[PDB]
Paper text:
PI31 has a globular N terminus (FP domain, residues 1–151) and a natively disordered, proline/glycine-rich C terminus (residues 152–271) that is necessary and sufficient for proteasome inhibition. We determined the cryo-EM structure of a mammalian PI31–20S proteasome complex after incubating recombinant human PI31 (hPI31) with the purified latent bovine 20S proteasome featuring a predominately closed-gate conformation. After model building, extra densities were identified as C-terminal domain residues (aa 189–253) of hPI31 located in the interior of the 20S particle. Portions of two hPI31 C-terminal domains were identified within a given 20S particle and featured the same C2 symmetry characteristic of the β-subunit rings. The modeled structure is shown as a linearized hPI31 chain extending from the vicinity of the β5 active site of one β-ring and then crossing the interface of the two β-rings toward the β2 and β1 active sites of the opposing β-ring. At the β5 active site, the dipeptide Asp197-Leu198 and residues 208 to 214 of hPI31 fit into the β5 binding pocket in a parallel direction with the Met208(P1) and Ile209(P3) inserting into the S1 and S3 binding pockets. Specifically, the antiparallel hydrogen bonding between Gly194-Gly195-Glu196 and Gly206-Gly207 creates a conformation that fits into the β5 binding site. At the β2 active site, residues 242 to 246 of hPI31 occupy the β2 pocket in an antiparallel direction with Asp244 (P1) and Arg242 (P3) inserting into the S1 and S3 binding pockets, respectively. The hydrogen bond between functional carboxyl oxygen (OD1) of Asp244 of hPI31 and the hydrogen of the hydroxyl group (HG1) of Thr1 may impede the deprotonation of HG1 from the gamma oxygen (OG1) of Thr1 by Lys33 and prevent the formation of the threonine nucleophile. In addition, the unique antiparallel conformation formed by Gly194-Gly195-Glu196 and Gly206-Gly207 of PI31 forces Asp197 to sit at the S1′ site and residues 208 to 214 to bind to β5 pocket in a parallel direction, which is in the reverse direction of normal substrate binding.
Numbering used by the authors:
A (entry chain D): 2 to 244
B (entry chain B): 1 to 233
C (entry chain A): 1 to 245
D (entry chain F): 4 to 241
E (entry chain E): 6 to 241
F (entry chain J): 2 to 205
G (entry chain C): 2 to 251
H (entry chain G): 6 to 246
The structure:
Amino acid sequence: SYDRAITVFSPDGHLFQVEYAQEAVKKGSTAVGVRGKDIVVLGVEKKSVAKLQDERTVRKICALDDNVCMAFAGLTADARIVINRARVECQSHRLTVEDPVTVEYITRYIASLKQRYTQSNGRRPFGISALIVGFDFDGTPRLYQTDPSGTYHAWKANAIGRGAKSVREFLEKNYTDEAIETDDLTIKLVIKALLEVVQSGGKNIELAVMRRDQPLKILNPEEIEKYVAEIEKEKEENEKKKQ
Amino acid sequence: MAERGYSFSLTTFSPSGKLVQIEYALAAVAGGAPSVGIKAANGVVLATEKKQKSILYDERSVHKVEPITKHIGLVYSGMGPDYRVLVHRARKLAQQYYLVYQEPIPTAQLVQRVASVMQEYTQSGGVRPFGVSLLICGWNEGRPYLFQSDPSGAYFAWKATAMGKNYVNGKTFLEKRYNEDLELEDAIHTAILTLKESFEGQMTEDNIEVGICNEAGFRRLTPTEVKDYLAAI
Amino acid sequence: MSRGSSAGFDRHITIFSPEGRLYQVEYAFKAINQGGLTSVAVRGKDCAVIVTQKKVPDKLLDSSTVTHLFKITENIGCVMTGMTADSRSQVQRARYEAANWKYKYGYEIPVDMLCKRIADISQVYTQNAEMRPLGCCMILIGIDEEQGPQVYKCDPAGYYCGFKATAAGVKQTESTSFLEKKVKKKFDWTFEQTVETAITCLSTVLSIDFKPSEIEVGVVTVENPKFRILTEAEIDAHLVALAER
Amino acid sequence: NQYDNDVTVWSPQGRIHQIEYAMEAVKQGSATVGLKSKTHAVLVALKRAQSELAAHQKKILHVDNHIGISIAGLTADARLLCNFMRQECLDSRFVFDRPLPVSRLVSLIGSKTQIPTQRYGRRPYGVGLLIAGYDDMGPHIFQTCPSANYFDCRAMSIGARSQSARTYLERHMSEFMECNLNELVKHGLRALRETLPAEQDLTTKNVSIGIVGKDLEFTIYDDDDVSPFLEGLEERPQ
Amino acid sequence: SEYDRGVNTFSPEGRLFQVEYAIEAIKLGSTAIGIQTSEGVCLAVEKRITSPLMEPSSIEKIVEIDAHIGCAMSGLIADAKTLIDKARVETQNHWFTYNETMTVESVTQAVSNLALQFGEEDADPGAMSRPFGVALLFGGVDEKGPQLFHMDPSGTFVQCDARAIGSASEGAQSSLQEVYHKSMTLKEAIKSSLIILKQVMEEKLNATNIELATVQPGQNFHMFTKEELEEVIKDI
Amino acid sequence: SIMSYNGGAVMAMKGKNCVAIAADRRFGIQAQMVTTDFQKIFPMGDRLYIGLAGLATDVQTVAQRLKFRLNLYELKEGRQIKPYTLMSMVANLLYEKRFGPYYTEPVIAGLDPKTFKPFICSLDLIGCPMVTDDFVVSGTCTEQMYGMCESLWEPNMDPEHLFETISQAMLNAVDRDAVSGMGVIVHIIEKDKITTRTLKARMD
Amino acid sequence: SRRYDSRTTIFSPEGRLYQVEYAMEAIGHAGTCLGILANDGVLLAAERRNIHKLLDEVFFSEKIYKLNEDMACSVAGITSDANVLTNELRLIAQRYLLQYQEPIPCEQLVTALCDIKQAYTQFGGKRPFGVSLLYIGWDKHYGFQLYQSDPSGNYGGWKATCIGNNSAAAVSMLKQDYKEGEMTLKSALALAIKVLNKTMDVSKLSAEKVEIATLTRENGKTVIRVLKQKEVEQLIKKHEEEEAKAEREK
Amino acid sequence: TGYDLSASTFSPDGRVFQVEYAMKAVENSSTAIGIRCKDGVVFGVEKLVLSKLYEEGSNKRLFNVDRHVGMAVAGLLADARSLADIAREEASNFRSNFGYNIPLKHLADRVAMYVHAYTLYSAVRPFGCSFMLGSYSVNDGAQLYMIDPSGVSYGYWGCAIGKARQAAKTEIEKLQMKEMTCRDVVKEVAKIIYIVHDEVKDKAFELELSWVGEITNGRHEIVPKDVREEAEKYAKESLKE
């Protein structure tokens, strides 16, 4: 019964509530997604490691269906609500269309929901940005990104959350067709992009991998540490080629 | 004319994390008339002062001590009309419980339901919290109960407690005088003495209202019995 | 918690002040006195009388329509003090409540029950912030079979009580003091004595000699429980009886 | 101040400022002129173009076979009001199989537009209408306001710089009654031209004409049907 | 500071504050140009790519309302999504009911009827709390020939021979006034639109920086491919 | 007709300080048997049981909704329910569907907590309780059960005699019913123990 | 109407929800609730903030509420909001049991209550619930579990956590002293007693100021019980004996 | 400060200032008067002609609420029209329910309650008009009631509402209306309207007259043109000396 207009225009033509939701996104942990030829990799930074926390309960990477999975940055509870609604929509689409959803379709649904929450009485916009990845029926890898305002775009590599600007600059300087030639190369690229803003050297990195016609796979800390050690080895190779 | 109400909460958190509307309702309660409840071994006594500002009032028309069921009684401190609203709601809740389970409601269940109503008014939109604290007595399963519900919707089980003006002094007096294994008559004497501790003027059988709950049920004490107790004190 | 302290919107809507008060209710109490009139109700051993002053400033006003005495049922009458439109709305509500009570329960509503219902409605107005409380005071008059004459008064705060005698309006404090003095010197009050007590209370608190058209008297008695309004002839007879002594 | 943001707030002077602001919104629109003879009612509207490459905005709308309107103010409010009037006329023709009288339609418009001016969170309709109709009582010219007040007019002009048009209509009201259709349309065109600056002249691009009469349904002449009415108009007297 | 007034309060000048603020919000969008000729209608919009990692093919500032109608949008595209969906649904409803195609004017009117349907009080749940922040350029071909329409959140819609919307709508409109004439051909219209876009765009015009679509009599809505864009930008 | 769709028979009997509840085990559709171990008696406490005869779907629905409400009641009250309170709760639940009735006739047997006084009762499909002192029967063979119980029941029976009486009554009553049988399960509720027995019965 | 609205569900210029932070301050002003997960069980150790000689004995527990046959919760913050949330939790658990005829997994119940909290923090114009909850339970999927929920709607699983007064010091103590995978219920109880003793520095530890509840599995059944006064007294005596032994050995 | 923004807020003195502001809006309107005589009620309105372009009879302030009831209004004309619609609906509903014409006192009470319903909440705004109700019947005689924006309704012998109501009241008080008939009361009302009008402040006005009584057989109607011309001539000749 609450019908207050929360998101309204400012004299300069700005929606202040949407801008503040984007600011709330900017305070979230960094999430990185990179599209490869045969793989899609999602990497999320852990802001702090508590050593007393069950890590399974605070995962920022989840699957929306058997082919689509997403990461987020911002408010965890709003992200949970959005993920639940997206999962329900995926099941409904699998019912009515008798075909699995495409990444673009679920990204459109999420973006439309966010836009609806930016232009409806008595509610505030969601404070999350999402990185939706997956594979279409033909096998084409996909990477999309939504924002609180409700706009979405396709990307080859992107980063949201805090420190997203520097990570995106690193991806721009480093994303090449030869940097995603192999799956391990894509994983190392994602870990290197995450390492530009995080400390502890891979201990604060939650990494996920999704392959063509395969379920989403979460790397254990042993594999992540092995990849970090390999990255340090390549750093030493660059050192030896320098001198 | 528009029958819609305000849909936003009037009670909100402060930068220190406090709901100041609840604190102001508590201040309204603390400015009310003294009320005393004492749980004895075989019953509970609810006592309060009702001194009208003039002799033109009818002492026998408005009662501050009210029965909810045959075994539950009520008394308050704070705002009278709010107490009337809560008494009506408590009676309705007890009757609904009896309609469902065909047994009289336990005191704890009624206290929980009334506290839920008070919380609803503390959180819902376009309303203020109640300006009353309730002292609820009852007899269930061969055992007496005494409860206090505050404007915030929180309830406590008490051996003896006081509300309203000089309720801290009354609490200290009860701590000095209360003991377990107390008989009902001694509890009534102690409650009347607690009222006298802060009573201004002369206390008669019409200035105060006493209600008792025991195995036979809850009943208000007639002015003749109150006069007998006062003479015995 | 200090006296006169204010916070937020406690002066504008019915929310608690730091001291725990509701200022809007007190402002409605002042709106009662904004009317400028005064009414007195007195209870006898077999009767109950309401007297209010009747002010008709201009001759262009039809005097038969300026009435502050209303009948709720055949046996219940009321006098309203305060804002006129609020008083009329409350009178309509009381009439509806009495009629509905008779329809639902099969017997006439007691005066105390009607006062309690009106007080409950006014309390609902005091708790919700979206609506104004009514700036009117209602005094109810009736005969109960078990207990006899009944005088009940409800206020905008949701408070109601029974009275041996009561007043409302600008001069309610002086009238209550006068009635306190009269009641303390307790003696048998017949119908005539009760009417004279109410009339002389109004006259002495207003400090003016009364004419039969300047007041309005309504009574209920045990012999005739129907509420009636005295005509100018009967009021003149009572005034003559008062003036001779 | 604190009294000019809500339509439910009276001012200490006994005025409502939001209604006056909506009247200003009406005054912001382009000028239109309505006038009637014994047998015809004519609306002439001065259309405005946003740019040289933009078509001039519609100002005269069809309501029924006997009723047409010219708008000035918020265009979306005008479309809402026009849809309401069209529905009312259609309901009248469906229930009674007769055209709705113009005065009763104007009363319905006033009743509809009064409601938002007294409820919290609503706003006055920011459009003013000139209504031309013909019924058993003859031709009618009506003017509605955001204040929900309406006027029965012999002639009227609303919009920007309408005071000069109103002065001209005041001057020639005595002869408006016995004019034929062409003379009445020329009078309306001269009144509308009185609102135009000297460097601006009435042309087939910025003039719209709506006519209703005894044997003539409501018709709108916009671009090439306006030239016969424009032909014969003398130069500006200055 | 932004809650002192309701969404439906007039300014002392007779303007709704929120509508004016949405008009201001339009000027932050990318420039879009529509030109109407006797041979058809052409729409051109600047994509305004922010990062090279972004895929320009995912930006859709020109959409197909129907086989004979296209829409170019400027401002807040997420706000334009619902208006575009409403336009498509209206066209399909009209086809279902009457077995014919909508006129461009009727589609623009149906979309514009949604502009002012906002407000707090007396509103169903899910109603709009604010005006839209988009300007729409509707270009299509109906029985009246090719037609171009412009719509803004004020609810006003007009027919335009050639119009520009967005951040550089002032300079582009002045350029449109010079180049445009009634006898213009479709190829001339496309070339002039691309020239003005190149003049007003910060980045260099290329096959990925812009969108261009045409509607012609006898041909459906057609969005130019990358090779066609490369051919057109070859000589300007 | 609707009550005879699935068959079934539930019986409760009162002892000196104990109660017994018995039911047949057949689950069937019209004249076809499906399973021989359908549950019709449900525990509603340590010493409280309810038996449901009628539509099998309504039996399951009523049992589950009653468990829902009883779990909420025990979590709130902080105590175990009394058999009379459980009877009132079942009556309320059944009367809520007065115009959409469940096709079940519950039978309640148990000992009052803190007193261990035997309690038995039966209710109709809309929730009219009938508290008796000897026995209550429900199902498709109520006449045979009534005859057997009226012939065999005695006041102040020990748990062994109560078991023998209820077993003989149920066995001989379901031996004369077409859509009841395929085994009998008996629960004997004492103060200190509960005994559950399945009887050697006919399977035709 | 607009003038009196507090706008409890709007963003701040820095992207913060002020009402949620103020409710978290309210949580920080509440009593200490402690939860430790062991190998053979999980426990709750709350501080009794309702202490007075004229108070009656509690029925079951002041701050620990049983949610179903397999779960229990502890609350910190506004008490009546906690009552509402516990009633809702019991309703959700019973609804799941009705739908599936199986006890609800703990994380699903926590997720449902957190969804309700988030719904209050996003729309409606109402103030949020000022309650933080600790959840303990057992389920067939993940065994013994311990969860913590915030008024914002954020939850998470833990091995040992604390909410309420002096929660940061308790968290540091648990970080220093909790051993992952090696904890037994006895060692967990000792750690809980020592943490409550150190955090409640103003008041010396006694069995009348703390409430302890444990959750164990006994032959295919979940046993949620509250430690009696003598048991807590023995725990405190053992803690004091160990402290005196350490003092002597230093 | 801020105590005068809502009708649901009392001032510290105990006043509702929004209602007072609505009454102020009423006080800015032109004067309409109504006089009750021994056989009917006569209404007279000083209808200001703001523009010469308006048709005669435009913005009429006299309404037929029912066959036997007339209404004279002052203040905001849109609010007055809404209140006239409310009164018409009340009379129609009364006839539909109880099967006979509504008494004028009952209709006045119903409309006054409807008006008072708008002086209690912040969601609505008090009416900015005050009006008179006149009626005549054989059983009830002549009745005249006035309702102000606060919702107060009183019966009158002669009432005036608008810009100049005190001077109009002074003029009315000189009339022995209790024995007069509608024929003389029409001329007296015309004379009072011409007396209280301000020629310097207001350019011109139309004299709108209506009556209900035995001469109209219990119907409210506009005073016939002949009587109106005679009354206007008498008023003009009385203004001259």
